[PDB]
Amino acid sequence: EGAVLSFHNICSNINGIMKPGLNAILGPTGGGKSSLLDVLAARKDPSGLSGDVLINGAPRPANFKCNSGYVVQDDVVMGTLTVRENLQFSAALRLATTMTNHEKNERINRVIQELGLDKVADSKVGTQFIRGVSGGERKRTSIGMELITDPSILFLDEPTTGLDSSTANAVLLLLKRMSKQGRTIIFSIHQPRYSIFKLFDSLTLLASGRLMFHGPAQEALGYFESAGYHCEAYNNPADFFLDIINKPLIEKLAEIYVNSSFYKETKAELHQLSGTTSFCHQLRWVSKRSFKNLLGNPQASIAQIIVTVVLGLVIGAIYFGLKNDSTGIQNRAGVLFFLTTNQCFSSVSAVELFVVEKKLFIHEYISGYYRVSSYFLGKLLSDLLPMRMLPSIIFTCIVYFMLGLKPKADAFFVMMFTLMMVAYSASSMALAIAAGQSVVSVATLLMTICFVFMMIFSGLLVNLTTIASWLSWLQYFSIPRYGFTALQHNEFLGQNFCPGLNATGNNPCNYATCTGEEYLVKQGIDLSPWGLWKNHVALACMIVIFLTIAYLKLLFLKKYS
Amino acid sequence: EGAVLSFHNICSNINGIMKPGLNAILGPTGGGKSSLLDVLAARKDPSGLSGDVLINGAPRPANFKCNSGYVVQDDVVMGTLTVRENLQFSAALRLATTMTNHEKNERINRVIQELGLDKVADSKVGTQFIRGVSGGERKRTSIGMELITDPSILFLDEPTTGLDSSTANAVLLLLKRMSKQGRTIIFSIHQPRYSIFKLFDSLTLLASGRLMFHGPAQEALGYFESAGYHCEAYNNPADFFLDIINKPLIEKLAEIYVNSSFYKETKAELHQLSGTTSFCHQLRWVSKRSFKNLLGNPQASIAQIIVTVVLGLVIGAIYFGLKNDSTGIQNRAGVLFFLTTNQCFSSVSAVELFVVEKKLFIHEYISGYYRVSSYFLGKLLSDLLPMRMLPSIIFTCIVYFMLGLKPKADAFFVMMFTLMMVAYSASSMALAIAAGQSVVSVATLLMTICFVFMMIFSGLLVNLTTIASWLSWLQYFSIPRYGFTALQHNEFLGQNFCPGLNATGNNPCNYATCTGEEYLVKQGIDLSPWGLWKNHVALACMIVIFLTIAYLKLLFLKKYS
């Protein structure tokens, strides 16, 4: 039916009314257009918002995000999925369990057929680096993810930017077709074309937070020629209009039709208006999405896999056949110090995984696709849990037998699990520092600095026993001490390193370091079997604390957006 | 007087003629506009260029770059200089030694006064992060660096992009003022405004390498309405023109006025046309520019200075008072392995210095401001030579006495100079890999991978003696073996490490490592005094070879551009 929208003097000193149809907002950049669209989006409640908001008479803060439609400037779709897997995803995540798969796919066919994308509906729509689909059709899919709920009101932020001539106008033809479907749509257009400007039925303007003329395009020309400076002479009078409308110019030139009977006419119209699944199915489904996205992207996966394979081979070649001579100790303690520390900076790529999809995270949370614990535990299942398993098991299996470490099977398991835990914990710190930022680089430098300051406090490079006591306490903040201490706990402990010297109750060699025990105690490591596993409890404790910090960052920044 | 420009059928199948005045080129992106401007720029001679080029009758390849004027899309000015230091720089580098400083500054005053920038002429025009000057005035200075030689022909690439409404039009007013000064100007405008489109006297078009209509704007409307699809109805007929002009459409719609008497008219006009300082002053002057640019930028300088100071303090605190106990060796050999390797990755920032100014390098070489050896030896004097001196001398002076290394003054000098050389050599490798690329990141990852593969072949982490012989040869490709080997040559050599054990002719401790000699030989380092300095000859040899590789990359990519 008729969908109307009302705003009484909201904040500054701006009134609003929307008929069932099509409408855009327009103005110079920094004119508050996207911030007015933040107000229209109902994304930030503690912001100063002083005025009355009526959505068909109903108040604003109650359940507005569920049925409204909102699309950001960016059109962020998963970089490897297709159209159909996208709309099956957001279809099966927005709509309830009651809708069957055939009725869901029927909605999918009416939405894709409504947009005319069936030819591309099995083409991989994520086009960052593979470039299978034109960007305007990707914009159509991004809008279609809001078409899934069949909304009444749609908000689009900058659809004209980032496209060429004809495709953006064709998108505007499909959006005019959606206006024909009985919906209200609101744009925020940077700099349009005069043809679709003629196609507009209404348009408002913004001047740095100041309300300018709302009304039709031909009546923007009419009520603007009433304000003087008549637009003629083929000067693109939408853009020439835009060039005359931009402080006594703004306040006075708006004020002279504050006095007008059109503003009092719609003010009298304003006075006339005064009289999902719980936990498991969503993390399985989102984890299915990003898990397929990792399977869909061979670049970041298989690049890291071939790096850790060939690097595992090179460490296998250099250290091949570790002898038990005098040169055994600093060679065995060499490679362990590499691997742990390798895992630590191999976690720096895990800074990327929460920062790239951040706009998709905040857009998908303001719409409410998921619960945050379901998101976080889901995405952690998707990327971190399998991809941190692979270089651990690959490293242990290809370097453990070239090097000739301990032939016992359980020691191979402790090395396996140890590289697993130190990978998850360094990656957990990378998430704990990384989550909630927009820039990868500053967090990357900050993580690199904290990993070198944890590198020094491993056992190799300082002898942790002889630090002075007023800063020897901060050993415990170092993750490769836990990794390196475990990996040289399970691997030195039976060994022996001076040929011909038994060195049990060693006599006139003192100072000799002719066991693995003497290297461990001289290094300062609890030779008791609990001293091996307290490294792992310290590890898992750092996993839980660091992921809790990232979790609290997500709950505290989820509404900031 | 009258400056004319002629092109007979150059390549594809494109003819050219320019009157004394103002002209732009226009078309869809990827239409070959900037490549046609590469042809007009005379930057790539081995490219396929088949046709006749006449500049007032004179041929093209002889000395065209000296008197022509060319500005790239970007307006790259030094990020910290002001307008006056910029134009004093390019004034004193383009013009000869014969021009006195007062006449040079008089030209500066007529050019700045010609552009109307005297109010900003002492404001810091480099506005990447400090943002002192509007970008349009920075564009005016970038054009003024071509106004220094007082050219006849000026080429401007995309002046309208990257600016707001009024400032770009005001720039076009100053450029129309330059057309009033009796010069020919050629633009390449992405998407203009109809007002300055009315201000054009002539305009050509490009369709993916195909020559479209050249002529006046009102005659673009006239000869285009002769081609059908008449432009009316306020549709921005420059942009609506642009929307109708974009394969039988291109070839046929251009071909129907290939037949026209205007194209045969200008073809009959074409048939009518058929009938510095040596070495020292320039490197002192450019080295003055970038040296002031480093003094002008406290961010990259003082950030690295406070990092190496506080990092020097922390290494001073952790290792404070190195004891000569059993734990001495792995502690002294710890910190040395840090510092060298620190310097190596502290060279990764030196990847940045030739890649950021790359567009300014190629633009400043196609104009011919300098000689390449003068550029390279100048820029190496500017950034690399002082900034690599500071963390070496700061590290040695603040960690050398906290740690309590050898009290001799010459050993302090060898450590000082050694950290200097390993900093210059790792930085030299960073230049040798870095120079000639546009992306910092891939070279950054590639440098990080080669620095870890040189990290393993230092003395600490493998015991270089017991590598198998078929890949022990590649020790010599590692830079921290040279640094670390020198720093532990001058610092272990007198020492002693087992308290109460004299260990000269050591008896029933064998295996003991109770000198600094036994650690050196057991590490595999020439205990003779030449074995200290051959590290430095290997260093300086790597400096000369790596900088030679970067030098050859600059001579081989200088004309690629």
Partner: antibody
């Protein structure tokens, strides 16, 4: 090796005391590390500190700033001075000779009681 | 590292086997010497390396134990072997001794 230390049998509190352990048999700069060990009245022992053959010193970190051990190479002597004494430091004192590669304090001085008293 | 030599007294008759157990606070890894202080003398070295024995002793003395437990064991406790026995780690400076054990003769 034959060690013999000799000095005062008393010092006033908040002063310094000096002892000297004349060594016959080796040179102080030849082989071993050379050591001072107190013993509280009754039973308890406390290693104080060694200067080794190359003049570097190591002191028991309980006795920070208060002990200093010096070396006189020509007479084969090594000295302690203990600054800011206390009647706690009334103790039997010993010079003792540390092998290094055996690790154990092999030879000991015969001993002199030192009584801090007012 | 503090040693802990418990107990500090025994009263065992002549010609017997007696056992002294020095307990470290960390691992000291056979770096544990036993010293044998008489009444009125300096501590003479008895057991070096926690197993061996300095020459010039009746070889009735036997140092055993590893890990953290160490033990001097005297078979046929003679008259000369009453005294005070101080265990002493030398794994790391400072070289804390033990509290000592004053043996006694049964009456």
């Amino acid at each position: 090796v034959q060690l013999q230390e000799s000095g005062p049998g008393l010092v006033k509190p908040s002063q310094s005391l000096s002892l000297t352990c004349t060594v016959t048999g080796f040179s102080i700069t030849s082989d071993y590390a050379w050591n001072w060990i107190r013993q509280f009245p009754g039973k308890k022992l406390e290693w104080m500190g060694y200067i080794n053959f190359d003049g570097g010193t190591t002191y028991n970190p309980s006795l920070r700033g208060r002990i200093s051990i010096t070396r006189d190479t020509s007479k084969n002597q090594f000295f302690l001075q203990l600054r800011s004494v206390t009647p706690e430091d009334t103790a039997t004192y010993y010079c003792a000779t540390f092998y290094g590669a055996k690790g154990t304090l092999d030879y000991w001085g015969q001993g002199t009681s030192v009584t801090v008293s007012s | 590292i503090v040693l802990t030599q418990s107990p500090s007294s025994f009263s065992v008759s002549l010609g017997d086997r007696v056992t002294i157990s020095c307990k470290a606070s960390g691992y000291i890894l056979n770096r544990l010497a036993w010293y044998q202080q008489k009444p009125g003398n300096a501590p003479r070295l008895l057991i070096s390396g926690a197993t061996s024995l300095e020459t010039g002793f009746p070889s009735r003395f036997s140092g055993t134990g590893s890990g953290k437990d160490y033990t001097l064991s005297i078979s046929s406790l003679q008259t000369e072997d009453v005294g005070t026995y101080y265990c002493q780690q030398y794994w790391s400076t400072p070289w804390t001794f033990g509290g000592g054990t004053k043996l006694e003769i049964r009456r």
